[PDB]
Design a protein around this ligand. Structure first.
Ligand code: CLA
Ligand code: CLA
Ligand code: CLA
Ligand code: CLA
Ligand code: CLA
Ligand code: CLA
Ligand code: CLA
Ligand SMILES: CCCCCCCCCCCCCCCC(=O)OC[C@H](COP(=O)(O)OC[C@@H](O)CO)OC(=O)CCCCCCCCCCCCCCC
Ligand SMILES: C/C(C=C=C1C(C)(C)C[C@H](O)C[C@@]1(C)O)=C/C=C/C(C)=C/C=C/C=C(C)/C=C/C=C(/C=C/[C@@]12O[C@]1(C)C[C@@H](O)CC2(C)C)CO
Ligand SMILES: CC(/C=C/C=C(C)/C=C/[C@@]12O[C@]1(C)C[C@@H](O)CC2(C)C)=C\C=C\C=C(C)\C=C\C=C(C)\C=C\[C@@]12O[C@]1(C)C[C@@H](O)CC2(C)C
Ligand SMILES: CC(/C=C/C=C(C)/C=C/[C@@]12O[C@]1(C)C[C@@H](O)CC2(C)C)=C\C=C\C=C(C)\C=C\C=C(C)\C=C\[C@@]12O[C@]1(C)C[C@@H](O)CC2(C)C
Lengths: 171, 177, 75, 185, 162
């Protein structure tokens, strides 16, 4: 037996079907992640990603910041929370500008078919081309994704701060 | 087809009848070795050199132990320990003998390899018949057989004397009685 | 001395490096070490690569073990 | 079979070997391992077809029987006296003579001599594996000549193997009992 | 008790009680899943039993080397995290089970690459199964011995309580 084969029977792609790229564990694990989980609107994907990211982002800032405390301090928790929230704001700014400069679409998975059927004799790159058919690959989709990331980041950072305070106080 | 010495063994292929003392006693088939410059010619030359060396050594031990040492030489009757007494007082004799034996052995090895290469010299042959005791044939074969048998017996004897002198630190006939 | 009696040279005894390498295949490695014997017996540069890499690593190991366990008197 | 009738036969105990009755409950005469490879680890010779485990076992059984017969003779001899006409062999039984003589440098000499003979006759065994007509245990040793008359040879064969089995068991008992018929525990 | 992998020399198709002679393919897939999960968990449990007995670096020593005693000494908030991790792993395994071409114990998805399996692949799967079975028996024996005697594996062996 051989556990490495050309990806999708194409020996010319710059890719391989290894026990890591195309394993059933990899398939299921990546399909349960918010970025690829089926049945999620882009706002929901952004909200979940932001929640998880703020939740694990408050950690390093609170623990190793400039205002640490070997005991529990409200000032240390506030400093870590503010740093995490501002980092989420910076990431949201990056997401917003990236989406602004990347896509020009409001409804995908159709425009591609329209220009593959009804011809696309225009300036292209909006009618024709169009990389990716996901709802995240639109101006509207990425805007809602960034909004969800930002709101979920705030909520997750607050939740993680509350959990840290409870763990440090009642344990 | 069966070896004369060992009837339960097939005749060793390389030992037909030619060499003196041949009775087919090669249970391990060492005569068939043809590697590391070792073959039947080299093995026979080594056997003959061992035979001659053992004969000389056994004769020397017996002579010195029975008739005593030559004048001016140490005594003690232990031939394995009297060597260090000779070296302690006449090291130059031992060194000169060693150098002579070394040169003669280099010549012997060169002769063995040459005679093995361009086959003209029988193994163990050094053209040393100053008194002409083996000129004619039909006596040369008998003399070869006598030399081989005496040399094997003296090989065994000399090894025994060496081990006895090293272990018991006494003379050969001293161990005998 | 024991390790020197491993590879088959002139008798029916020992190993053939070709047979050892060719038997070490696997699911993840395809043909495995097939052809490595031909590579290392027809290319001086491959032998030099292996020998020089292991030789430099050995030199560094020697350097470590030297001061770590001084092997000479008054060194 | 002719013994243990509820087992048919091992597989190879046809009857071509002397003293054959068919007794082999464990089927040990069917191991595919050529035990000559315990001597010559490699095939070595291209003509080495191989030796059946049954023939190797027959050679081992004959050798064991001869060893045990000589051993019981010696052990019985040293129980009733019979010391060698030389010093340093006084009386020290058989349960202690072995160690005291291993100490006195002559059991090593016996080991060397027995090993020399064993190596020669094992070369015979290896030639048999190579495909010589020599049968197991046949060293062609008939100096006195009571081995002619093929019927007498076959009778003496079966006699030797049966006596060897008896002597193996008797030596096991004698060494285990530390002798009871001629000495005490 | 089929052409399934796991039949070894000592007892080929070992179903003395006929559990598989009447079951359909789905029940047999369930049985294989249970056997493989038990075997893997038991291999981990045996290795942990021994290693914990002669090495417990975590928790600043303490956490008495005898298992079934350290079970009641872990902070019980580390128990929760191990439980949640196992739960997430088995949720992922459940998600894997609905992938097309799924095989009972195959969570690596080897069916993607292994079509027309060899004898080496079957032999390795049988090796895993047999090691898992031996580890199941071993861990059952470990737990029972520690319960009845009170000493751990290398402690009972060292004293000689056999
Ligand atoms: C120091 C100088 C010197 C040199 C250069 C040689 C050179 C030689 N001798 Mg030699 N020899 C010398 C001194 C020397 N001898 C002395 C002082 C003696 C004692 C008087 C001998 C006794 C001697 C014998 C008896 C034999 C040789 C043989 C040989 C040849 C084989 C060399 C070889 O491969 O041995 C490799 C070196 C070894 C030490 C290997 C031998 C190992 C054995 C197993 C030792 C066994 C000991 C046991 C107790 C070679 C021409 C042999 C020959 O001609 O064969 C055709 C041969 O049979 N020599
Ligand atoms: C393998 C042959 C061999 C070897 C190595 C020796 C070696 C030795 N013999 Mg010797 N010997 C031999 C054969 C041999 N012998 C034979 C065949 C005889 C009888 C003819 C003698 C008769 C003999 C006597 C009578 C004496 C020695 C002595 C000696 C010792 C000092 C002489 C010396 O350096 O020798 C090389 C000498 C020359 C080349 C001359 C030395 C240990 C002397 C000794 O100290 O004995 C205790 C001594 O007195 N030997
Ligand atoms: C060539 C024939 C030969 C002869 C006649 C002898 C004769 C003798 N050897 Mg001897 N020996 C020989 C070859 C020979 N050996 C060989 C080839 C070796 C191996 C290299 C030995 C190794 C040897 C040792 C190690 C000892 C003897 C001892 C003895 C003596 C005691 C005999 C005995 O049965 O005690 C038993 C006796 C004089 C013994 C001795 O000197 O007794 C004091 C002793 O300790 N021999
Ligand atoms: C298995 C066989 C065997 C063995 C191992 C022994 C061993 C021993 N016997 Mg012994 N013995 C035996 C059979 C045996 N015996 C038989 C059959 C007899 C009756 C004939 C005797 C009669 C006997 C006497 C009368 C005495 C001993 C003594 C001894 C002890 C001293 C000898 C020694 O130190 O080792 C020496 C080395 C060996 C014994 C190894 C044997 C090597 C032989 C000699 C090689 C040749 C074998 C021969 C040619 C076989 C022919 C077959 C084939 C070639 C055709 C020793 C424990 C002495 C003692 O003090 O015991 C307490 C003693 O006084 N034995
Ligand atoms: C030390 C020198 C020496 C050497 C080189 C040999 C060589 C040989 N002997 Mg041997 N033998 C010797 C001394 C020696 N013998 C002595 C001193 C005795 C008397 C005790 C024997 C008794 C003896 C018997 C009874 C048998 C051999 C057999 C053999 C042959 C096979 C050996 C084998 O496979 O490994 C041997 C390796 C072992 C680990 C031995 C097995 C021990 C068993 C499993 C346990 C028994 C209780 C201890 C081989 C030709 C056998 C043979 O010819 O088979 C066809 C055979 O049946 N020998
Ligand atoms: C069923 C498996 C199992 C379970 C329940 C436990 C349980 C326990 N172990 Mg433990 N252990 C195991 C296997 C297991 N072990 C194995 C296989 C090893 C060998 C590496 C160890 C080595 C080990 C040490 C060295 C120590 C413990 C300790 C402990 C105790 C505290 C928890 C801890 O720190 O774990 C620590 C566990 C590890 C460091 C190794 C766990 C590695 C896991 C089992 C493999 C990967 C699991 C993965 C997430 C899921 C599989 C993926 C896929 C197959 C689905 C606790 C009673 C500590 C203690 O107090 O001892 C008394 C301690 O110091 N264990
Ligand atoms: C995602 C990262 C992550 C983080 C931040 C933590 C954080 C923590 N774990 Mg932990 N853990 C994780 C993943 C993580 N875990 C995983 C994946 C496993 C495997 C199941 C464990 C298994 C585990 C055990 C078994 C234990 C911890 C414990 C702890 C706490 C003490 C750690 C420390 O050094 O004190 C700061 C701390 C709250 C310990 C604890 O809570 O005891 C007080 C404890 O015993 N963890
Ligand atoms: C270390 C991992 C390891 O060596 O496992 C060994 C693993 C097993 O490969 P094979 O079974 O095919 O090897 C068999 C023969 O090639 C022997 O070399 O090799 C790889 O898959 C290479 C992937 C490296 C991935 C780096 C991480
Ligand atoms: C390459 C080579 C030669 C060659 C070649 C050539 C040149 C290329 C030509 C051809 O083309 C090929 C070839 C291969 O032939 C090899 C050379 C040979 C060697 C390596 C020489 C070894 C000799 C050693 C001996 C012979 C020593 C013996 C020791 C004794 C000790 C005696 C004692 O008294 C002492 C001292 C103390 C006492 O208490 C007791 C004892 C222990 C008995 C007995 O005597
Ligand atoms: C090598 C030699 C002696 C070597 C001795 C050594 C190494 C001993 C060294 C030691 O003892 C010391 C020193 C001190 C100890 O603490 C250490 C040792 C090591 C123990 C003598 C050679 C001695 C060499 C001699 C005697 C040579 C004689 C040559 C003659 C007669 C030649 C004649 C011819 O040349 C003509 C005349 C005409 C030609 O055409 C024909 C011929 C026939 C060839
Ligand atoms: C068990 C045994 C044989 C058992 C045989 C059995 C069961 C046979 C059963 C059958 O036949 C029957 C009954 C009926 C058949 O129809 C069926 C079978 C089945 C065929 C032999 C042991 C044999 C055991 C032996 C031979 C042990 C020997 C030990 C020796 C010699 C020790 C020597 C020493 O050297 C040391 C080690 C130390 C020195 O200090 C001291 C000494 C004493 C000198």
């Amino acid at each position: 037996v051989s556990f490495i084969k050309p990806y999708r029977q194409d020996p010319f792609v710059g890719h391989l079907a290894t026990p890591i790229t195309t394993s059933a564990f990899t398939r299921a694990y990546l399909k349960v992640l918010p970025a690829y989980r089926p049945g999620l609107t882009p706002l929901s994907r952004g909200a979940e990603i932001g929640f998880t990211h703020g939740y694990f982002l408050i950690g390093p800032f609170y623990t190793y910041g400039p205002l640490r405390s070997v005991e529990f301090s409200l000032t240390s928790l506030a400093a870590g929370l503010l740093a995490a929230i501002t980092l989420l704001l910076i990431l949201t700014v990056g997401l917003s500008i990236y989406g602004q400069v990347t896509y020009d679409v409001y409804d995908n998975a159709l425009i591609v078919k329209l220009v593959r059927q009804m011809v696309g004799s225009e300036r292209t790159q909006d009618l024709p081309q169009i990389k990716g058919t996901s709802e995240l690959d639109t101006v509207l989709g990425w805007q809602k994704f960034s909004e969800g990331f930002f709101s979920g980041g705030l909520i997750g950072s607050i939740v993680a701060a509350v959990g840290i305070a409870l763990y440090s106080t009642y344990l | 087809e069966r070896s004369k010495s060992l009837p339960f063994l097939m005749k060793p292929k390389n030992l037909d009848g030619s060499m003196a003392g041949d009775v087919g006693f090669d249970p391990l088939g060492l005569s068939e070795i043809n590697d590391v410059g070792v073959d039947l010619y080299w093995l026979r030359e080594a056997e003959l050199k061992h035979c001659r060396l053992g004969m000389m050594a056994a004769a020397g031990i017996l002579f010195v132990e029975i008739l005593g040492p030559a004048p001016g030489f140490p005594a003690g009757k232990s031939q394995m320990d009297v060597f260090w007494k000779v070296y302690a007082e006449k090291p130059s004799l031992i060194g000169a003998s060693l150098a002579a034996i070394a040169i003669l052995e280099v010549i012997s090895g060169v002769a063995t390899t040459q005679g093995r290469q361009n086959g003209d010299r029988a193994p163990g042959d050094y053209n040393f018949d100053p008194l002409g005791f083996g000129k004619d044939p039909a006596k040369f074969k008998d003399l070869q057989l006598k030399e081989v048998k005496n040399g094997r017996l003296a090989m065994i004897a000399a090894a025994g004397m060496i081990l006895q002198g090293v272990s018991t630190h006494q003379g050969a006939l001293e161990n005998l009685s | 001395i024991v390790a020197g009696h491993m590879y088959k040279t002139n008798w029916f005894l020992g190993h053939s490096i070709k047979t050892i390498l060719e038997a070490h295949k696997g699911p993840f490695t395809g043909e495995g070490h097939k052809g490595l014997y031909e590579v290392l017996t027809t290319s001086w540069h491959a032998q030099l690569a292996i020998n020089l890499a292991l030789f430099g690593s050995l030199s560094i190991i020697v350097a470590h073990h030297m001061y770590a366990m001084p092997p000479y008197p008054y060194i | 079979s002719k013994a243990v009738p509820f087992l048919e036969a091992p597989k190879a105990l046809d009857g071509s070997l002397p003293a054959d009755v068919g007794f082999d409950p464990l089927g040990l005469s069917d191991i595919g391992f050529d035990f000559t490879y315990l001597m010559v680890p490699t095939k070595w010779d291209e003509s080495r077809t191989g030796l059946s485990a049954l023939k190797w076992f027959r050679e081992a059984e004959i050798k064991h029987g001869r060893f045990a017969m000589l051993a019981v003779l010696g052990w019985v001899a040293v129980d009733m006296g019979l010391r060698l006409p030389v010093a340093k062999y006084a009386g020290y039984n058989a349960v202690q003579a072995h160690d005291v003589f291993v100490k006195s440098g002559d059991m090593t000499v016996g080991l060397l001599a027995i090993g020399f003979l064993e190596v020669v006759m094992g070369a015979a065994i290896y030639e048999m594996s190579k495909g010589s007509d020599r049968a197991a245990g046949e060293f062609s040793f008939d100096p006195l000549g009571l081995g002619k008359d093929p019927s007498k040879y076959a009778r003496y064969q079966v006699s030797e193997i049966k006596n060897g089995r008896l002597a193996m068991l008797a030596f096991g008992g004698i060494a285990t009992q530390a002798v009871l018929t001629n000495s005490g525990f | 008790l089929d052409g399934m992998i796991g039949s070894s020399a000592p007892f080929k198709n070992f179903d003395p009680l006929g559990f598989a002679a009447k079951a359909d393919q789905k029940t047999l897939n369930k049985y294989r899943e249970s056997e493989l999960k038990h075997g893997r968990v038991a291999m981990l449990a045996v290795l942990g039993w021994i290693v914990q007995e002669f090495w417990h670096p975590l928790y600043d020593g303490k956490l008495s080397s005898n298992p079934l005693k350290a079970l009641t000494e872990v902070p019980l908030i580390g128990w929760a995290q191990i439980f949640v991790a196992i739960n997430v792993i088995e949720y992922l395994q459940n998600k894997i089970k609905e992938l097309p071409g799924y095989r009972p114990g195959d969570y690596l998805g080897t069916w993607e690459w292994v079509e027309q399996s060899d004898e080496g692949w079957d032999s390795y799967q049988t090796k895993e199964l047999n090691n898992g079975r031996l580890a199941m028996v071993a861990i059952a024996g470990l737990i029972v011995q520690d319960l009845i005697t009170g000493q751990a594996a290398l402690e009972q062996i060292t004293a000689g309580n056999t």
